[PDB]
Amino acid sequence: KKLFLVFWWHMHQPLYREPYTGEYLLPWTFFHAVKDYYDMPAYLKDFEIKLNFNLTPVLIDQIQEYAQGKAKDVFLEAIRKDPDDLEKEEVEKLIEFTKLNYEKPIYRFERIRELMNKEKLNREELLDLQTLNLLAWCGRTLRKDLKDLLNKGRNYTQEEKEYVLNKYFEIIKKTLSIYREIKEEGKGSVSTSPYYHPLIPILLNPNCVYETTPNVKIPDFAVSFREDASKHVELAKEKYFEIFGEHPVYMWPPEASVSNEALELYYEKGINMLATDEVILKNSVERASPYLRYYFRELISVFFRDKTLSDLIGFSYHAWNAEDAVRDFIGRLKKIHESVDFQPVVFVVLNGENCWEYYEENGIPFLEKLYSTLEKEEWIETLTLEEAMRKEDVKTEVIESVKAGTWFDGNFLKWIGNKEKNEYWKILIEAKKKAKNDYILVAEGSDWFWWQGEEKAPFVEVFDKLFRSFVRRAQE
Numbered sequence: 001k002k003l004f005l006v007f008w009w010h011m012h013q014p015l016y017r018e019p020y021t022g023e024y025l026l027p028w029t030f031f032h033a034v035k036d037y038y039d040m041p042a043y044l045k046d047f048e049i050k051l052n053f054n055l056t057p058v059l060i061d062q063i064q065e066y067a068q069g070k071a072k073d074v075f076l077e078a079i080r081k082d083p084d085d086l087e088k089e090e091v092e093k094l095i096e097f098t099k100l101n102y103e104k105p106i107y108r109f110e111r112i113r114e115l116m117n118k119e120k121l122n123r124e125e126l127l128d129l130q131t132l133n134l135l136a137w138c139g140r141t142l143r144k145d146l147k148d149l150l151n152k153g154r155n156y157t158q159e160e161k162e163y164v165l166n167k168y169f170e171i172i173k174k175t176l177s178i179y180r181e182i183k184e185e186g187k188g189s190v191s192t193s194p195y196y197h198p199l200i201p202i203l204l205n206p207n208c209v210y211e212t213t214p215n216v217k218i219p220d221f222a223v224s225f226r227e228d229a230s231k232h233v234e235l236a237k238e239k240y241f242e243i244f245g246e247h248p249v250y251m252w253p254p255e256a257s258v259s260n261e262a263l264e265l266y267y268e269k270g271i272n273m274l275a276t277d278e279v280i281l282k283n284s285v286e287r288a289s290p291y292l293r294y295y296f297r298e299l300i301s302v303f304f305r306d307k308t309l310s311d312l313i314g315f316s317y318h319a320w321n322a323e324d325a326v327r328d329f330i331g332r333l334k335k336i337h338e339s340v341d342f343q344p345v346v347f348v349v350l351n352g353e354n355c356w357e358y359y360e361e362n363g364i365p366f367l368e369k370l371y372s373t374l375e376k377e378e379w380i381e382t383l384t385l386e387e388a389m390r391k392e393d394v395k396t397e398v399i400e401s402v403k404a405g406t407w408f409d410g411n412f413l414k415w416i417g418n419k420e421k422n423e424y425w426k427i428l429i430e431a432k433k434k435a436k437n438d439y440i441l442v443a444e445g446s447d448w449f450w451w452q453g454e455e456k457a458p459f460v461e462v463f464d465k466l467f468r469s470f471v472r473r474a475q476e
């Protein structure tokens with residue numbers, strides 16, 4: 001009697017490329033590409049398990065731009081330059097980027113503490129600041145190859161910095177290939193999301209927010225976003241088809257966000273399976289076990305992720321030592337395995353690139369120990385999404401209706417309902433009336449609304465510049 005375990009790592013970045021200048025205004029796609037987007041599937045080279053991935057189309061666009069050498073990344077340019085050529089504005093951004101990241105485990109170099117305590121940096125100190133910011137984001141593959149440069153920890157030269165940069169771009173250039181390979185080998189399924197990661201239930205019917213938060217104030221949606229919701233899904237099918245050669249039959253709904261209308265749209269667009277969050281399940285049915293495969297109105301298959309297991313990796317186990325964390329995770333799977341006399345399906349679904357920076361050594365000890373243990377446990381079978389979709393020896397149930405929500409408390413409050421987030425929607429609504437191109441779809445991404453009306457400086461001014469630039473460009 002097996003326990004079926006399904007990892008589904010979601011990868012996404014909003015579009016950081018300013019439409020007028022073409023400049024990538026933040027380096028987050030570059031840094032997660034070199035740290036996570038290649039290395040997370042590359043674990044499948046060394047471990048005989050199945051792992052699944054979601055790639056948003058807007059992320060794929062950016063990965064391709066960096067791989068082709070076309071991305072003009074302003075923070076990266078400040079890294080690459082000889083410090084004698086740095087603008088004062090570039091030295092300032094270098095220091096602010098360091099201070100934002102200072103306390104993360106992947107930044108635990110004694111030298112960074114030294115450099116942040118100095119009143120002013122000479123050329124050698126700036127070279128160490130640039131190169132340590134680079135090396136802090138080193139992924140698993142190159143942490144082996146560049147181990148000696150990493151251990152050095154100080155006194156970096158321009159040549160060593162450029163060497164690291166060349167190896168990083170080699171990693172980016174191989175990134176789409178590794179997703180194609182693990183897919184062709186049956187080592188994992190690859191899904192996508194509606195193109196720019198929007199809140200599909202809101203675009204289809206903004207009133208769905210009242211199913212969970214009736215007291216929320218939302219602006220006057222004086223224009224229809226229903227066609228745009230279709231276009232996000234349709235364009236995403238086309239981008240996936242270009243990259244992987246087939247139309248996707250699995251999709252990750254952004255923010256796990258579903259509604260009756262959204263599920264109908266995915267079904268209409270040929271999606272056969274998605275996943276969403278256990279809170280939505282609890283809100284929608286009485287007996288809310290997440291270990292069943294659900295069928296929404298016999299139209300589309302829906303799995304509900306195990307929220308506690310997903311949150312343990314996503315948020316808890318950074319605060320644990322790696323071995324203890326793996327023992328805790330396996331022990332919880334044991335309890336699930338023992339708690340039912342059927343074969344449970346256990347979906348572990350979370351962002352695949354954001355939690356590791358808070359783990360010791362970028363989560364590599366944790367994931368290596370976790371996957372090594374999993375590959376040898378005889379009562380656990382890890383599945384591709386395709387295997388989980390067609391598994392016959394599991395329990396099954398039909399659901400007729402869901403309560404609209406997201407994996408954030410089962411509601412939409414992180415993207416709508418306060419004055420500053422509502423202002424973004426009002427701006428989008430007014431721009432949509434006059435929109436003339438697909439940059440309006442870019443501005444519909446959830447990321448812009450997530451950061452608006454929050455304390456989270458800095459670079460929130462940069463997300464604001466991006467959103468409003470996309471809104472302006474959509475009208476021309």
Ligand SMILES: OC[C@H]1O[C@H](O[C@H]2[C@H](O)[C@@H](O)[C@@H](O[C@H]3[C@H](O)[C@@H](O)[C@@H](O[C@H]4[C@H](O)[C@@H](O)[C@@H](O[C@H]5[C@H](O)[C@@H](O)[C@@H](O)O[C@@H]5CO)O[C@@H]4CO)O[C@@H]3CO)O[C@@H]2CO)[C@H](O)[C@@H](O)[C@@H]1O
Pocket residue numbers: 010011012013014028032100255351353354446447448450455456457458459460
């Ligand atoms: O204030 C409390 C809060 O603030 C601080 O967070 C800061 C981060 O620690 C800091 O690094 C920076 O956050 C960056 C982030 O590091 C960077 O990668 C980028 O974030 C990307 C994600 O990487 C990307 O995956 C995507 O995330 C989506 C996600 O895919 C989706 O499934 C869902 O979960 O929504 C996410 C957001 O839309 O996109 C984002 C960009 O939108 O940019 C971030 C912002 O610069 O800055 C944060 C402070 O401003 C604390 O340190 C943090 O721990 C606290 O919780």
